[PDB]
Scaffold this active site. Sequence first.
Site, PDB file in Angstrom:
ATOM      1  N   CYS B 120     -11.436   1.876  -0.067  1.00  0.00           N
ATOM      2  CA  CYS B 120     -10.130   0.289  -0.381  1.00  0.00           C
ATOM      3  C   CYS B 120     -10.744  -0.759  -0.750  1.00  0.00           C
ATOM      4  O   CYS B 120     -10.720  -1.230  -0.796  1.00  0.00           O
ATOM      5  CB  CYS B 120     -10.215   0.307   1.431  1.00  0.00           C
ATOM      6  SG  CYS B 120      -9.331   1.995   1.803  1.00  0.00           S
ATOM      7  N   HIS B 256      -8.938  -5.472   4.116  1.00  0.00           N
ATOM      8  CA  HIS B 256      -8.443  -4.189   4.484  1.00  0.00           C
ATOM      9  C   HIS B 256      -7.610  -3.589   5.800  1.00  0.00           C
ATOM     10  O   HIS B 256      -8.611  -4.164   6.450  1.00  0.00           O
ATOM     11  CB  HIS B 256      -9.089  -3.489   3.385  1.00  0.00           C
ATOM     12  CG  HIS B 256      -8.895  -1.896   4.075  1.00  0.00           C
ATOM     13  ND1 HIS B 256      -7.598  -1.626   3.298  1.00  0.00           N
ATOM     14  CD2 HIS B 256      -9.265  -1.373   4.826  1.00  0.00           C
ATOM     15  CE1 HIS B 256      -7.427  -0.083   3.761  1.00  0.00           C
ATOM     16  NE2 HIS B 256      -8.521   0.167   5.012  1.00  0.00           N
ATOM     17  N   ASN B 287      -2.543   2.024   7.332  1.00  0.00           N
ATOM     18  CA  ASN B 287      -3.373   1.715   6.561  1.00  0.00           C
ATOM     19  C   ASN B 287      -2.876   1.821   4.944  1.00  0.00           C
ATOM     20  O   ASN B 287      -2.998   3.889   5.310  1.00  0.00           O
ATOM     21  CB  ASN B 287      -4.426   2.784   7.183  1.00  0.00           C
ATOM     22  CG  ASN B 287      -5.866   2.149   5.962  1.00  0.00           C
ATOM     23  OD1 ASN B 287      -5.404   2.021   5.789  1.00  0.00           O
ATOM     24  ND2 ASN B 287      -7.014   2.073   7.440  1.00  0.00           N
TER      25      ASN B 287
HETATM   26  S1  LIG Z   1     -10.397   3.670   1.988  1.00  0.00           S
HETATM   27  C1  LIG Z   1      -9.404   5.159   2.542  1.00  0.00           C
HETATM   28  C2  LIG Z   1      -9.738   6.183   2.974  1.00  0.00           C
HETATM   29  C3  LIG Z   1      -9.080   7.492   2.721  1.00  0.00           C
HETATM   30  C4  LIG Z   1      -8.126   7.483   1.577  1.00  0.00           C
HETATM   31  C5  LIG Z   1      -8.330   8.618   0.643  1.00  0.00           C
HETATM   32  C6  LIG Z   1      -7.405   9.295   0.113  1.00  0.00           C
HETATM   33  C7  LIG Z   1      -7.363  10.611   1.612  1.00  0.00           C
HETATM   34  C8  LIG Z   1      -8.487  10.974   1.332  1.00  0.00           C
HETATM   35  C9  LIG Z   1      -7.945  12.594   0.334  1.00  0.00           C
HETATM   36  C10 LIG Z   1      -7.661  14.071   1.983  1.00  0.00           C
HETATM   37  C11 LIG Z   1      -7.386  14.298   0.893  1.00  0.00           C
HETATM   38  O1  LIG Z   1      -7.724  15.641   0.497  1.00  0.00           O
HETATM   39  O2  LIG Z   1      -5.429  14.975   1.122  1.00  0.00           O
HETATM   40  C1  LIG Z   2     -14.965   3.327  17.421  1.00  0.00           C
HETATM   41  C2  LIG Z   2     -13.517   2.807  17.681  1.00  0.00           C
HETATM   42  C3  LIG Z   2     -12.785   3.749  16.270  1.00  0.00           C
HETATM   43  C4  LIG Z   2     -11.440   3.343  16.298  1.00  0.00           C
HETATM   44  C5  LIG Z   2     -10.973   3.948  14.888  1.00  0.00           C
HETATM   45  C6  LIG Z   2     -11.562   3.457  13.948  1.00  0.00           C
HETATM   46  C7  LIG Z   2     -10.349   3.589  12.599  1.00  0.00           C
HETATM   47  C8  LIG Z   2     -11.320   3.714  10.731  1.00  0.00           C
HETATM   48  C9  LIG Z   2      -9.815   3.069   9.704  1.00  0.00           C
HETATM   49  C10 LIG Z   2     -11.352   3.652   8.352  1.00  0.00           C
HETATM   50  O1  LIG Z   2     -10.280   2.706   7.700  1.00  0.00           O
HETATM   51  C11 LIG Z   2      -9.956   3.115   6.405  1.00  0.00           C
HETATM   52  O2  LIG Z   2      -9.441   2.873   5.679  1.00  0.00           O
HETATM   53  S1  LIG Z   2     -10.660   4.622   6.134  1.00  0.00           S
END
Ligand SMILES: *SCCCCCCCCCCC(=O)O
Ligand SMILES: CCCCCCCCCCOC(=O)S
EC number: 2.3.1.301
Lengths: 334, 332
Positions: B120, B256, B287
């Site tokens: 991200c 982000h 997100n």
């Molecule tokens: S910074 C956000 C991190 C999660 C988003 C990246 C794409 C999803 C991961 C791939 C999952 C899949 O294999 O479909």
């Molecule tokens: C300890 C509390 C847990 C809250 C959930 C955390 C969420 C993280 C989201 C990941 O962000 C991205 O884009 S990767």
Amino acid sequence: MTEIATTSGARSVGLLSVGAYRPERVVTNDEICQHIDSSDEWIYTRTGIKTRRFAADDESAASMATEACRRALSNAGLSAADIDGVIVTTNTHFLQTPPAAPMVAASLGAKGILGFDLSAGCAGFGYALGAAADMIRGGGAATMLVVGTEKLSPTIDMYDRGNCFIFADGAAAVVVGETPFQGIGPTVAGSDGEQADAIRQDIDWITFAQNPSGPRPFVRLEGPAVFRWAAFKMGDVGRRAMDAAGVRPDQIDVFVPHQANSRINELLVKNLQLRPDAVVANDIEHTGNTSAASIPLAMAELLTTGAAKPGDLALLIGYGAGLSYAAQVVRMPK
Amino acid sequence: MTEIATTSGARSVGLLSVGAYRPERVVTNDEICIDSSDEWIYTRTGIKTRRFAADDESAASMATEACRRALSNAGLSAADIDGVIVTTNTHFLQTPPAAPMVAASLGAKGILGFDLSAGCAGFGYALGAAADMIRGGGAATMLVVGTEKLSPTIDMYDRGNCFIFADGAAAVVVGETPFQGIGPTVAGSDGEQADAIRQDIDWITFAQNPSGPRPFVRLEGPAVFRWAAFKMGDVGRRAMDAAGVRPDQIDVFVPHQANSRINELLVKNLQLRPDAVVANDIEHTGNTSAASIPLAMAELLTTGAAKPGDLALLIGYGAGLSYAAQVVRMPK
Ligand SMILES: *SCCCCCCCCCCC(=O)O
Ligand SMILES: CCCCCCCCCCOC(=O)S
Ligand SMILES: *SCCCCCCCCCCC(=O)O
Ligand SMILES: CCCCCCCCCCOC(=O)S
């Protein structure tokens, strides 16, 4: 009312080194004549390939990149702690996330350094080098790794009589930092999105994943169409790259096109109007087409064999997937 | 021997315009259950609703839509643009790359471009790479587009994340500006935590054994929370520092859109003005990973909270454990 500060870095930057990694397993033309109907004679004539390198099951695009990066720093006489950022260019990183760069940086013991993955078919290196040189001049970094890396093996359809014998594995890395004289020229690049289907993965991973037990995706290639495009269009591209760098074609000591196919490259040379004694990279003969990895691997081979010397005025043209290209004039590393 | 030319572009470069695309369909908290609730999900995440792209939509298709709008808002046509950088985590093709296709679809098929992958932090890096290319002489005007289609990646049983991710795209036009409009890029990573946010199974290992499970997005909430909330404050300080701007000068914080609670702690740490404006697009966008920031910029601009030319801190953080930051001026 307020002013955003502006930075600047080195004026001249260059390929301080090149470091190549090639896997142990040597797969001969003969050792693929199993699942296809042809000869060693046949494959070699149309491609230029004699043998290729296949990585092992536990080896990956990131592991191979690391070992290449490790070698690059050695040849540049630098440790990981001297590096400010790494850019991985690849087409065979098989995770949508995480990126490869940070893993690599951590593998080398430069865990916190900047990095991303650049994907642009076999124009990746040209673009990555461009971005690196551009970042360092802007003052974003001082010294960088750029690494073309590829595990194409797993994506071959061993029955695809059109491309099975073309792709292979490996990784090579360069170090880009300040230099006494300008060592990387302007990047000349572009695309042709209309012919995106020429080189492709036939089934997207999501479609496949929803219907797993059906046909699985492979690398597909419309040979004829990629031949004609490369052979009839890259000639101009390279001229744009020489014109940008302010160099005559007769001044290029070394031609390193992407190692797609020997016929194509032969035609490119004749078109570019080079010196009768310019050294044209042909690593493809025992390395095969390694996509984003091909140019740096080509460079390394030419230096290892002594056919090119450090300091030689070289021309790099990358071309391939998505129908994208990137070119520039550089000085040979090491 | 023989000289290689030293070229140079325009010194000062900014954001001319932002353009956003969000899909039609609104997926409400209620419309997803695990064992949760509206007040449960809103407490841990800050999310209320999110949008999902349709089955015939893609990372690439949304990117084009986003770009097309960014271009409209810039007062520009596709012929004015010298290249496009697509930053995404959900282009589900090893090759070909997304950028030329977007380029083709925009009607400027010839232009240069590539896909940049950096969790991200992708946008931060892609914005950086653009301004750098424009300042170097390799392009005069450019599109940077963040696009994401996370719907198909989500596992509906994953009580940890299924309600976190959404779809969307937003692009910006970068080009010559009377004053400096993009601060110096501040970036880094934490390779030693590559698994914190990951795709649990690689595509080939899955393909070679389809009778096993399929890949999904997997997230280690706790580890990602610690890292983002207690490190990214420094990153913000380093970016403001490079831009030669004080904290109390920032008009708009756009971190982000991972998590409102993470971003809540970030604002406190950054020690900004009481009246600084905080990106909260996540409430109704969710997100959208590499697309969140420009979306959040567009949302703030649409909403009135952020005016054109405001001073905006950007902090991208996420997968691979990658971060990228800059102080930019608000576009439009
Ligand atoms: S910074 C956000 C991190 C999660 C988003 C990246 C794409 C999803 C991961 C791939 C999952 C899949 O294999 O479909
Ligand atoms: C300890 C509390 C847990 C809250 C959930 C955390 C969420 C993280 C989201 C990941 O962000 C991205 O884009 S990767
Ligand atoms: S420039 C060469 C690009 C072709 C190789 C790209 C990687 C393989 C394509 C994906 C095949 C698959 O895994 O289905
Ligand atoms: C039977 C003729 C052999 C095919 C020639 C086409 C070669 C194009 C391969 C380019 O793929 C890339 O990596 S780009």
